[PDB]
Amino acid sequence: KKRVVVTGLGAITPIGNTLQDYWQGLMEGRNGIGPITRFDASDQACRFGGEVKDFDATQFLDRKEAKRMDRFCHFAVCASQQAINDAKLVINELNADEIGVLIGTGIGGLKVLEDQQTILLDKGPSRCSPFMIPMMIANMASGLTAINLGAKGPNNCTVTACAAGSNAIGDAFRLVQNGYAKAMICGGTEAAITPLSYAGFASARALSFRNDDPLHASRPFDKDRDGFVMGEGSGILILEELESALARGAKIYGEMVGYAMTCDAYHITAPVPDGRGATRAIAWALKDSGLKPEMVSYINAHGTSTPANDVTETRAIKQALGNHAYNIAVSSTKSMTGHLLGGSGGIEAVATVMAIAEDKVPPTINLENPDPECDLDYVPGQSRALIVDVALSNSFGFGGHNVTLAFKKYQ
Amino acid sequence: KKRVVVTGLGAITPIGNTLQDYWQGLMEGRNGIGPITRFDASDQACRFGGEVKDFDATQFLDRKEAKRMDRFCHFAVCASQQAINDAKLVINELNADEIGVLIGTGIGGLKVLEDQQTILLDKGPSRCSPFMIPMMIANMASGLTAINLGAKGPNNCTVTACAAGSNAIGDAFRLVQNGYAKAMICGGTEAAITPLSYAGFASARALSFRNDDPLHASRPFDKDRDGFVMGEGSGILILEELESALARGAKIYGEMVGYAMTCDAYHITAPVPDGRGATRAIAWALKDSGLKPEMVSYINAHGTSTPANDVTETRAIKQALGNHAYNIAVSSTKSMTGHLLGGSGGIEAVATVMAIAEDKVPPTINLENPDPECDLDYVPGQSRALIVDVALSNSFGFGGHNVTLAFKKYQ
């Protein structure tokens, strides 16, 4: 198996529109949650979320191209450009065939779907946009990114809800490990802060309804948590075969070493009580990496701030790491960014890789009183200096997908 | 690398609701195209398609469960049950963790999206169904199938438009090859015959507009083709590690041996003129299989019946196989079933595997006068007896995804 290193990172999030701003935000416990402005949410059960602010796609994309793509693609393409520039990776006719793209999303172009359905009902099917399909479908993020960057290698798209970005990075990792690509632009993206998305997640009673105090709604592991807080954005990584990376003197953040996927085959949205699947995902990600649980330094938890997830995940971490679970640092950055759904795995992988390189872990803000069963060190309040030798990123998404990614310092 | 054999097949299509009926239909050149009945298409530019007929999900699924899932999931779960029964694969607590699910789709639960958006606009967001999200998202096919069958292994979902089902099978193939699963229930599904889907594809001028003669609208490689004809359904394969399959005396249709993915990085919906990406996908699928082009016996073409695809694909086959391209059989089963989008790769993989085991290839019906550039043997009119030692299945989907799967007789 080829070794795979992370050579570039890009991010557009509710707390920063660049890698630097995003990381600084995480280090300062920046809060990206606030009242919804992208649409009139006055008639919604949840009226706040984590929106990307001060972002203009036309600053980075050709005007006509930007006009012909949805926001979820704006994020993916722009975050990918960031990653490529960060990596200083030059893509030309000579290496284009060995560089692919794998960007996942959970819902894709919902905005287009809503706008077009509204048109269909009001003006008739003949008035619908001829660009509806190529702007709406989930794989457009990967497709448009490849066209923008000139990547002609494997181009795929994983749609596994909250785990979309993690599965994308994991699958890209395999492509490089198995020699099907020398480099992969991968991660996740989501721009689902829309009336229908909010209506659906609110109806399912999945979203926090703390409209009176949006700044403290997202509180992973806290006893008073009442649902996740949606966010939007994209996180992208450049995974590269070690020899190729070294040959060009690539910047190296760390090495990706493990990936595991399991399924509870229990319930479509509710996690299994004993957290068996999540436990196995963590245990197998470690086995895939040839690492013992005691080697883990930090875990960027899924920690969505829902009653069921946070305690089940804590149980899984404790079952997978044993007593060592109490000797590591765990934190949910969703406390600051909100749950980016398909994009969560992307920006969280970015945060995890940065932690490995910076020896600093982001906090779980808003955590005041954790449930008795959420008794680990969740790095509450402020970021903390810590030697991060091995770090995991968890994604336990709706649909029953349990995914864990493992990274470690490059040596 | 572990060897992977196909031990089970399932299919729900416009020409048959079971593996047996689907194959018999293909062998008889059965036409599954007709006027739309699932909705009033009187105001649509295209008013026909390939619908699944006489299918009642409640005949195979628990009533409450069936009610809580969209048609694209009905197809996936039921076709998967078919495949498992065909394979005689018993899934229990002892092997559940080594059996996963990977079912792709191109659009997922569009029907739910349309019904709910209509409700939102007419009654307000508070009236939207609490089950909107878990019935609409693409990964629900894989998730619900895992729950129904008890599969606790890797559960993923590839959404790459026309290539969704092929990428799903290809990715599942890698999981078994690399030891991450002993068996995988994989394929594709689609149930996008809806007002909005038709409005979008018609607006893009992608669909055939031969409303006066629907039975002969889908005519791959024919000089008078004018767009694809949408179909719905699902095709599922059971991929299994060879030793495990032999140990239980599994039925073996053939061996999966190759998978390749490339990207034109050219246009989001239009194929590159020289068909370079498609050529490389075919060439690399063969290299992945350790097979020379001269070994190919049959190719189940993507052949969507669009002006651009059919000629570009023919060019790609000729560029990849050389003179041998004129000595093989090529056929597009979409001529009979229509283009199932995300489900196309699934039912076409089913047809390809059956061809290997039956030594018979399905025809490209409706083909009367092929363009001068579409000069291969497309098995027009009727099925034909032919020794099928090696067979490929092509999927060149919107988004720039070029995928080729390779199968061969098990020896």
Compute the nearest-CA separation of A194 from chain B (Å). 11
What resolution in angstroms, rounded to 1 decimal?
A: 1.5
Q: In the beta sheet, which residues pair with residue B406?
A: B258, B392
Element (DSSP H or E) covering residue A349 = helix A344-358
A339 is catalytic: yes
Q: How far apart are CA A267 and CA A270, in angstroms?
A: 5
Half-sphere exposure of A321 (CA within 13 A, CB side): 25
Query: CB–CB of A156 and B167 under 8 A?
Result: yes
**By CB neighbour count within 10 A (0-12 exposed, 13-18 middle, 19+ buried), where does B372 fall?**
exposed
The set of residues, in sequence order, having a beta carbon less than 8 Å from that of A273 and lying 6+ positions away, is A312
Nearest to B72 by CA among B18, B145, B22, B8: B145
- List, in order of start, the domains of chain B with CATH numbers: 1-254 (3.40.47.10), 255-399 (3.40.47.10)
By the 8 A CB rule, do A312 and A273 touch? yes
Q: Give the best residue of B128, B137, B162 to mutate against chain A (max A CB count within 10 A).
A: B137
B121 touches chain A (CB under 8 A): yes
Would you call B158 and A158 a contact, using CB atoms and an 8 Å cutoff? yes
CA distances from B81 to B87, B146, B147 (A): 10, 10, 12
Interface check B292 vs A, CB under 8 A: no
Q: Quick one: which of A28, A24, A148 has its CA closest to A83?
A: A148
Provide the 3-class DSSP secondary structure of residue A393. Answer: strand
CA distance A105 to chain B (A): 10
Q: Assess contact for B32 and B336: CB atoms under 8 A.
A: yes
Tell me which chain A residue has its CA closest to the CA of residue B205. A130
**Alpha helical stretches, state H, A262-323:** 276-289, 307-321
Q: What is the CA radius of gyration of chain B?
A: 20
Q: How far apart are CA B100 and CA A281, in angstroms?
A: 13
- Structure tokens given for A228: 């996740």
By CA distance, what is B206's nearest residue in A? Answer: A130
Annotated catalytic residue, options A73, A78, A157, A162: A162
Terminal-residue alpha carbon distance, chain B = 17
Task: Compute and round to an integer the Cα radius of gyration of chain A.
Answer: 20
Selected residue of B84, B133, B184, B402 to mutate for chain A interface (largest A Cβ count, 10 A): B133
CB A203 to CB B130 under 8 A? yes
Way it was determined: X-ray
- Tokens 């999540």, located at residue: A278
Angle at CA of residue A37, ends A32 and A41, nearest 5°? 110
Please state the three-class secondary structure of chain B as a single string. CCCEEEEEEEEEECCECCHHHHHHHHHCCCCCEEECCCCCCCCCCCCEEECCCCCCHHHCCCHHHHHCCCHHHHHHHHHHHHHHHHHCCCCCCCCHHHEEEEEECCCCCHHHHHHHHHHHHHHCHHHCCCCHHHHHCCCHHHHHHHHHHCCCCCEECECCHHHHHHHHHHHHHHHHHCCCCCEEEEEEEECCCCHHHHHHHHHCCCECCCCCCHHHCCCCCECCCCCECEECEEEEEEEEEHHHHHHCCCCCCEEEEEEEEEECCCCCCCCCCCCHHHHHHHHHHHHHHCCCHHHCCEEECCCCCCHHHHHHHHHHHHHHHHHHHHHCEEECCHHHHCECHHHHHHHHHHHHHHHHHHCEECCECCCCCECCCCCCCCCECCCEECCCCEEEEEEEECCCEEEEEEEECCC
- From B386, B145, B297, B304, select the one nearest A265 (Cα to Cα): B145
Q: What's the CA gap between A16 and A267, in Å, rounded? A: 35
List, as ranges, residues 240-279 from B with C-beta within 8 Å of A: 261-269, 277
User: Nearest-CA neighbor of A183 among A288, A106, A94?
Assistant: A94
- For CA atoms A376, A283, B237, B107, the dihedral sign is positive
**The token pair that represents B336 in the structure block:** 């009979």
CB atoms within 10 A of CB B98: 20
Classify A228 as helix, strand or coil.
strand
Residue pair B381/B375 in contact (Cβ under 8 Å)? The answer is no
Q: Contact at 8 Å (CB) between A341 and A304?
A: no
Residue A209, classified by CB atoms within 10 Å of its CB into exposed (0-12), middle (13-18) or buried (19+), is: middle
Does B128 participate in catalysis according to the annotation?
A: no
User: Of B99, B101, B132, whose CA–CA distance to B248 is shortest?
Assistant: B99
Query: CB contact, 8 Å: B76 with chain A?
Result: no
- Determine the residue type at B101: V
